[PDB]
């Protein structure tokens, strides 16, 4: 219902765009915006109205009749209408916690006030507001959206859907379970599809409606502004999960025969990359994937990734704790210990025992560097763990002192073993 | 956001890792990618509220009897786990786990979780169990157990099918708040 | 002997610049800074430290031993030192009420925090303080400084002084008598000249020290960023008295017949233009005059300027009063009544009696354009005074009411006559 | 800062305007440039206090007797001015100005100012005055006048030499402060 409705609205928006009827295009902008505010989608409402401000110039030109919403309808310079809109939009972005966009718009406004219209009161307020946004980015928690890929297959679907795949932007920490419950609500005639693997022409050509849904991972987009610079986790992480057009799906696949003791020796990964028409967030909560690639990760490439990720986690936690000293220590205990004493899952030994024997290296010479990289990662895991454990040592409750005393033990023993074997690294 | 410490105990068979990781990664059923390191973390809005759920994976092996409980202090909730297809684990709930947990955390709430639910109706599994003169655990047996050990809730689930899975952790958090 | 100490210090400074000795040059930037802080000149202290930062780059390159100041001498990136100095400077300019400069440097620092080192706390604070500076420019009085010309004549002066003229930026509330008093104590052997006229070679070549000093008028420098823009008196007025290279002096000279009744018919103006090496404020309270020219203004031309100035005053006051209603009326009462009922000095009636006789026109054909200009100015003065009076009418106290009614009468009558003669204008 | 409304009265000969404008423009002595428009304003500091001093220059002619006092209400200080080279102006201080000012502003402070100080020692001025059996006004004659009408101060000065000038306004303000 609401979903399809938004789709129809955007399709007509595009029709009027393509047919260069500006009045109608604008009108539909506002229809779409009202749908968004109905759902409390403040972000997508902002991106929507920006479609309007795109048509306005910073100018003293009297706004045309067509260029104005049928609601407003009074003489205004372009600069004025644009200013008013920018205020509304910045407000929407604020409510949806995209503060980098609010800031970007504020900046434009600020340049007008200072360079063009010379209003220092407004500039003053603007700067104070930017100062609050910049502060907010740092001091306020912005929950990570989950993203989901939905394929729509079968002749039962409209052309704008049929046999395509979209990436959706979920609500805060939203789970596929619920997202898909709702979605299925949108498509009563549809069958829930039981796989994540792309279907054949036997499906795509069937008369009904078959829907595929699975969680995908957002890839950080290349940012020139961040290129060689020392950007702090709290600033860059957001972009890790937001303003994104590239997404990954990873599936485990067993190739070769499984060793029961070591499941990691046999675990290949099938990784699909999706690229959307426009980045998310945007004027809709979903965009169509226009590009798809596949890659296969060997058990070793995967070990390497796992290790990279763990190291990353520990480093990040260390900075997060080093900066804010009010945090609960439980999360640190859990992560650190989980890596220092992986009594259940086995830790990087499962990797050694898998890749460091003579047989493997003899069977895969082309893997030499990777093997070395792995060793390096393990060598690098030690000083990191130690840095975080020292913090743990300062912050830990008395209740947990015996727990910590034992963590340190395991660590010391592990530092000793690993340094002997892979070398020393200091951070 | 509020942090919650959930310690997960129970025997080897039970498949705790599989459970936790299957949940926290929002994985498609069967498609979870295991790793070599312990525990796991979720962020969720549970009832009206955002929280960070620490899930501590304990080793149920006997060599750790003296070390394991070092994790206990400051725990918000416990998940005691057994396989619905492993009568022995089910017994070790009253035998070992509840005793241990209660010994170190007399105040802290327990949730009793049967696992491998997807296997209770499995003809082959029922067969192997039968050969040993054994039968899988029924819901009322499990509930009986939970009521006995003063477990705040009793739940059944499967990591493979994910039936029942979200609800275990919902119940953990609801038991804390 | 602080003017002398500063002179020496600046001389050796220049020497070091020209001679490429950076350590000594910097040592003297700092000597000069301390000399300014002695006299409490924060503005010129800031301007001197900028001489130092001019050498630093925004960069992580270690500061050379010799680019650092003698006291500091610890390892620092260029950027670290630059930032530190910028903070100090921005502070000096604050105390100097130089807020447009403070804001400039702020802008620099902020682009650093935002684009380069990614510190959003420092950024956030920077932004709040810019906001305060703009607010300040808007809501806080900055006393207009006076500028004095000083000729140093005779062979008794050091060559850097000898037979040259300088423009001195006066302190707040400093008038020529105070200034000159303290100046002439710095030159005990100096005679004090009684004219503003440039002296001949008889004086310049004499052996003594002859000092000539008079107040000059600053001329608004042409600013690119204000060109076609609608800048507020509150903003641009400050540029009228500050950051200036050009000054006028006007000496009335009578030529021809003096009409006892109309002294304005016979009054010519001798206007000298001075141009300084560098703007004021700057490294010192005084800079040398390099170009100097002379122009002669006819009584008519002068009348034009006068009219123009009065019109402009009325206008500014109107803006000022509309904008802030808490203001005391006495200044408005005085200005308006002074221009509407000039019972003492006579008003533009004198201009009419002078230049609008058929004789004047038959004598001065070339001046016809200006004549209309004058008429125009006169016409335009009517709607101005009128708007001032409306305002006055709303504000005036019950004691000054009768006064106001009278002002009102004279205006209505004058409006009648002026419209009748030169036509209508309005705002 | 602090506003001060200073009203200037006296006969015509006295040359109030030249005084006012040459003080406010801080003009070079003799080099003052007149305008066709009345009054004048200065932003000055006195004893380290900033003030905006408006100077209202009144008409001394009797055609203005009825109109002039409309200005008087809410005056901070008055300057009553006579030329030291015009015995008659000195008299009208006693006969005309003081009575008028005091009738309208009974408690408002008054500075008594003799002007044209530069001419009191001028040969020709003294000789023309002698032709009519007149003398310039002596310092003590003026001081006496001031005590008489109750002037807060009595000052002499020349708008041309500018000697004595700055003091007049410093003293008016000091009289309000």
């Amino acid at each position: 219902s609401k979903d399809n409705r938004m789709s129809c609205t955007v399709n007509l928006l595009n029709f009027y765009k393509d047919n260069n009827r500006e009045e109608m295009y604008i009108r539909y902008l506002y229809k779409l915006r009202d749908l968004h505010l109905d759902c409390d989608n403040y972000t997508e409402a902002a991106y929507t109205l920006l479609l309007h401000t795109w048509l306005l110039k910073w100018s003293d030109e009297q706004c045309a009749s067509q260029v104005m919403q049928t609601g407003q309808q009074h003489p205004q310079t372009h600069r004025q209408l644009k200013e008013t809109l920018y205020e509304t939009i910045i407000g929407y972005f604020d409510k949806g916690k995209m503060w980098e966009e609010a800031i970007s718009l504020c900046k434009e406004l600020a340049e007008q006030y200072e360079m063009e219209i010379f209003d220092y009161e407004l500039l003053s307020q603007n700067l104070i507001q930017q100062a609050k946004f910049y502060e907010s980015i740092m001091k306020i928690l912005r929950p990570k959206p989950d993203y989901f890929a939905v394929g729509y297959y079968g002749q039962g679907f409209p052309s704008f859907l049929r046999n395509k795949v979209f990436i959706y932007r979920g609500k805060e920490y939203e789970r596929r379970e619920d997202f898909q419950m709702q979605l299925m609500t949108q498509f009563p005639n549809a069958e829930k599809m039981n796989t994540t693997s792309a279907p054949g022409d036997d499906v795509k050509n069937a008369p009904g409606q078959y829907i595929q849904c699975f969680t995908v991972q957002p890839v950080l987009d290349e940012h020139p502004r961040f290129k060689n610079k020392p950007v702090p986790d709290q600033i860059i992480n957001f972009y890790k999960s937001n303003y994104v057009q590239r997404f990954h799906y990873s599936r485990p696949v067993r190739r070769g025969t499984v060793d029961p003791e070591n499941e990691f020796a046999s675990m290949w990964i099938e990784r699909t990359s999706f690229v959307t028409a426009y980045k998310l967030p945007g004027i809709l909560r979903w965009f169509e994937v226009v590009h798809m690639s596949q890659t296969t990760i060997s058990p070793l490439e995967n070990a390497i990734e796992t290790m990279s990720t763990a190291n990353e986690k520990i480093l990040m936690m260390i900075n997060q704790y080093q900066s804010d000293e009010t945090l609960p220590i439980n999360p640190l205990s859990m992560l650190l210990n989980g890596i220092v004493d992986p009594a259940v899952m086995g830790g990087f030994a499962k990797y050694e025992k898998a890749f460091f024997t003579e047989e493997y290296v003899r069977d895969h010479p082309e893997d030499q560097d990777k093997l070395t990289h792995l060793k390096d990662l393990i060598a690098w895991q030690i000083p990191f763990l130690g840095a975080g454990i020292k913090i743990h040592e300062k912050r830990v409750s008395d209740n947990l002192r015996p727990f910590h005393d034992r963590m340190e033990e395991c660590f010391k023993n592990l530092k000793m073993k690993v340094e002997k074997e892979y070398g020393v690294r200091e951070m | 956001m509020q942090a919650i410490k959930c310690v997960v105990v129970g025997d080897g068979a039970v498949g705790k890792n599989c459970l936790l990781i299957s949940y926290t990664t929002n994985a498609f059923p069967g498609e979870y990618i295991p790793t070599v390191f312990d525990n796991y973390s979720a962020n969720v809005m549970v009832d009206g509220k955002p929280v960070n759920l620490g899930l501590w994976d304990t080793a149920g092996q006997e060599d750790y009897d003296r070390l394991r409980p070092l994790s206990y202090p400051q725990t918000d909730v416990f998940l005691i786990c057994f396989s619905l297809v492993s009568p022995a684990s089910f017994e070790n709930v009253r035998a070992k786990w509840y005793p241990e947990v209660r010994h170190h955390c007399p105040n802290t709430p327990i949730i009793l979780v049967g696992t491998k639910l997807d296997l209770r109706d499995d003809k082959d599994t029922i067969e192997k169990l039968k050969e040993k003169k054994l039968t899988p655990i029924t819901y009322p047996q499990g509930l009986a157990m939970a009521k006995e050990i003063g477990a705040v809730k009793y739940l059944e689930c499967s990591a493979l099918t994910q039936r029942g899975l979200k609800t275990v952790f919902d119940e953990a958090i609801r038991a804390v708040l």
Side-chain angles (χ1 to χ4, degrees), chain A, chain B:
Chain A
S1 244
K2 278 281 174 170
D3 258 38
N4 305 278
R5 188 147 178 222
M6 281 176 182
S7 263
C8 293
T9 305
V10 166
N11 287 324
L12 278 85
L13 188 64
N14 295 320
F15 162 81
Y16 296 115
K17 174 154 177 300
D18 294 340
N19 279 93
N20 308 326
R21 315 192 200 180
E22 194 179 310
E23 218 154 38
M24 285 297 84
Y25 173 89
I26 268 135
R27 171 186 292 186
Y28 274 57
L29 281 190
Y30 288 95
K31 284 184 56 66
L32 182 52
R33 183 208 52 184
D34 290 340
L35 298 175
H36 291 311
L37 301 188
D38 277 345
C39 291
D40 280 314
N41 288 6
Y42 283 102
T43 302
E44 4 286 316
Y47 287 104
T48 291
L49 290 192
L50 274 177
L51 287 184
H52 192 183
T53 74
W54 186 259
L55 301 175
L56 276 15
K57 286 180 303 196
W58 293 111
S59 226
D60 295 313
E61 180 177 357
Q62 217 69 358
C63 284
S65 45
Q66 42 164 323
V67 191
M68 285 175 161
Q69 175 189 11
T70 78
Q72 276 186 90
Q73 235 53 292
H74 54 97
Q76 244 161 342
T77 40
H78 268 235
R79 170 167 288 109
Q80 259 147 21
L81 180 60
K82 192 159 184 173
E83 183 178 0
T84 287
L85 288 192
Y86 266 39
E87 286 153 1
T88 287
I89 289 160
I90 294 168
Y92 289 177
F93 277 143
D94 187 25
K95 253 166 271 178
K97 292 158 165 237
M98 315 292 300
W99 292 311
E100 13 267 323
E101 292 288 28
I103 290 163
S104 267
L105 299 178
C106 279
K107 279 192 166 297
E108 289 187 54
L109 273 193
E111 185 183 58
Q112 292 299 300
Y113 296 151
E114 153 183 37
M115 293 320 172
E116 302 302 338
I117 78 208
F118 295 85
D119 186 329
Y120 286 174
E121 180 56 59
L122 281 190
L123 178 60
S124 187
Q125 300 185 26
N126 188 284
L127 299 167
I128 291 170
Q129 195 46 224
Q130 297 202 26
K132 162 191 168 186
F133 292 149
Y134 278 119
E135 189 68 0
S136 274
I137 290 173
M138 296 279 92
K139 288 181 153 183
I140 291 188
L141 165 71
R142 285 184 290 177
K144 191 181 99 297
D146 280 7
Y147 294 91
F148 321 98
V150 182
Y152 291 106
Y153 305 96
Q155 309 317 299
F157 290 107
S159 304
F160 71 85
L161 285 179
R162 182 158 65 222
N163 293 327
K164 294 192 182 189
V165 184
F166 304 71
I167 299 304
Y168 277 73
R169 176 170 146 100
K171 288 185 310 189
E172 322 198 278
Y173 302 128
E174 164 165 52
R175 313 195 86 252
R176 182 195 44 269
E177 284 116 334
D178 311 314
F179 168 84
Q180 176 163 37
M181 216 156 287
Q182 183 54 213
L183 194 50
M184 292 326 278
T185 259
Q186 308 290 335
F187 303 94
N189 294 331
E191 293 200 20
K192 178 173 175 175
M193 199 156 250
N194 278 348
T195 64
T196 64
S197 59
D201 303 326
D202 48 325
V203 181
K204 307 204 273 274
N205 287 117
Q209 295 181 332
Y210 315 81
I211 297 176
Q212 200 179 58
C213 178
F214 53 93
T215 307
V216 287
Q217 294 291 320
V219 176
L220 181 63
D221 214 41
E222 146 204 351
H223 283 71
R225 168 197 291 248
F226 300 159
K227 264 295 171 176
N228 294 130
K229 312 303 190 294
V231 193
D233 300 343
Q234 184 65 340
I235 283 123
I236 199 154
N237 284 342
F238 188 70
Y239 286 95
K240 274 149 114 50
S241 340
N242 291 275
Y243 316 114
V244 283
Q245 49 191 341
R246 193 171 214 92
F247 313 85
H248 288 168
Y249 184 65
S250 303
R251 183 181 57 197
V253 181
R254 310 225 161 269
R255 299 186 357 92
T257 298
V258 62
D259 165 3
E261 285 305 339
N262 207 337
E263 82 191 283
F264 304 90
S266 36
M267 200 178 61
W268 289 80
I269 295 178
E270 210 53 32
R271 182 170 303 169
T272 314
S273 323
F274 310 90
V275 187
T276 54
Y278 306 78
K279 36 166 230 189
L280 284 174
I283 69 160
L284 282 171
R285 274 230 180 268
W286 64 88
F287 293 114
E288 166 177 350
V289 312
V290 302
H291 181 73
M292 264 185 284
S293 103
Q294 203 87 12
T295 336
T296 299
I297 320 300
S298 80
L300 177 60
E301 318 195 59
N302 177 61
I304 300 195
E305 285 184 350
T306 305
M307 290 291 303
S308 279
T309 296
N311 285 4
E312 172 72 292
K313 248 178 185 70
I314 307 172
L315 227 63
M316 286 193 19
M317 185 128 310
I318 288 174
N319 297 319
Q320 170 195 336
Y321 272 85
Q322 221 157 31
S323 312
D324 170 356
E325 309 166 321
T326 89
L327 299 164
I329 49 104
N330 275 340
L332 195 71
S333 311
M334 203 194 55
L335 174 82
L336 284 180
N337 197 38
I339 298 162
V340 183
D341 205 4
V344 177
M345 286 311 283
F348 59 75
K350 314 289 278 156
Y351 292 139
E352 291 169 335
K353 299 200 195 63
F355 315 110
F356 290 164
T357 59
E358 272 276 52
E359 324 221 306
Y360 179 74
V361 185
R362 159 159 49 66
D363 295 350
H364 312 83
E366 68 290 356
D367 274 315
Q368 199 47 58
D369 285 319
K370 284 157 176 186
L371 283 158
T372 308
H373 192 20
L374 186 51
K375 317 199 179 201
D376 189 30
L377 283 166
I378 293 149
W380 265 111
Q381 183 134 85
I382 304 290
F384 291 170
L385 280 166
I389 295 187
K390 187 183 161 205
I391 289 177
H392 194 267
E393 193 284 322
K394 299 177 198 306
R395 316 257 193 110
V396 62
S397 69
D398 292 41
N399 272 3
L400 297 177
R401 202 102 221 157
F403 170 69
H404 173 102
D405 282 339
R406 161 77 184 180
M407 224 206 314
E408 219 154 61
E409 276 172 36
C410 293
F411 179 67
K412 296 179 175 190
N413 170 73
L414 176 81
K415 184 181 187 284
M416 183 263 304
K417 286 188 183 298
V418 162
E419 273 176 4
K420 159 167 181 181
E421 188 72 32
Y422 309 102
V424 208
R425 308 302 128 101
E426 279 180 0
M427 83 183 295
Chain B
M1 83 169 79
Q2 178 178 345
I4 300 197
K5 185 185 181 166
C6 183
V7 170
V8 185
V9 298
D11 289 14
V14 189
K16 312 186 290 288
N17 155 74
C18 185
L19 201 71
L20 312 173
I21 193 175
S22 197
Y23 167 74
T24 71
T25 65
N26 214 12
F28 197 103
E31 301 192 0
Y32 78 116
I33 304 163
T35 84
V36 306
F37 304 110
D38 288 330
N39 328 318
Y40 306 95
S41 175
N43 283 326
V44 325
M45 286 88 207
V46 60
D47 299 317
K49 309 161 190 166
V51 315
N52 169 239
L53 188 51
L55 295 166
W56 290 51
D57 198 353
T58 61
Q61 320 147 27
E62 300 184 315
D63 299 41
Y64 290 93
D65 286 9
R66 291 196 76 216
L67 297 172
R68 181 174 44 241
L70 299 183
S71 298
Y72 292 171
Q74 302 210 186
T75 297
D76 303 308
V77 56
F78 277 97
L79 304 180
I80 308 188
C81 299
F82 75 104
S83 182
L84 297 147
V85 282
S86 169
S89 57
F90 183 61
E91 191 56 50
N92 284 259
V93 170
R94 60 153 54 101
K96 181 174 195 190
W97 306 121
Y98 164 81
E100 177 173 300
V101 158
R102 275 305 175 236
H103 182 319
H104 299 74
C105 294
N107 284 333
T108 307
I110 297 179
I111 283 165
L112 182 61
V113 181
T115 74
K116 307 209 202 120
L117 163 80
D118 69 290
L119 279 183
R120 199 166 45 189
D121 298 303
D122 186 80
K123 287 132 275 183
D124 218 282
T125 293
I126 310 160
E127 281 324 316
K128 281 294 164 280
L129 277 177
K130 205 162 292 181
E131 290 169 357
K132 284 158 188 178
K133 280 164 92 86
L134 288 175
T135 161
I137 273 69
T138 74
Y139 190 96
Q141 283 170 335
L143 217 182
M145 194 90 257
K147 283 188 180 183
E148 164 168 359
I149 80 178
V152 144
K153 226 73 157 64
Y154 165 70
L155 317 162
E156 306 184 337
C157 66
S158 149
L160 185 59
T161 70
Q162 281 182 19
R163 182 140 308 172
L165 188 57
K166 186 199 178 196
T167 314
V168 173
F169 312 98
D170 280 342
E171 295 305 333
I173 301 178
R174 286 200 268 256
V176 176
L177 314 156

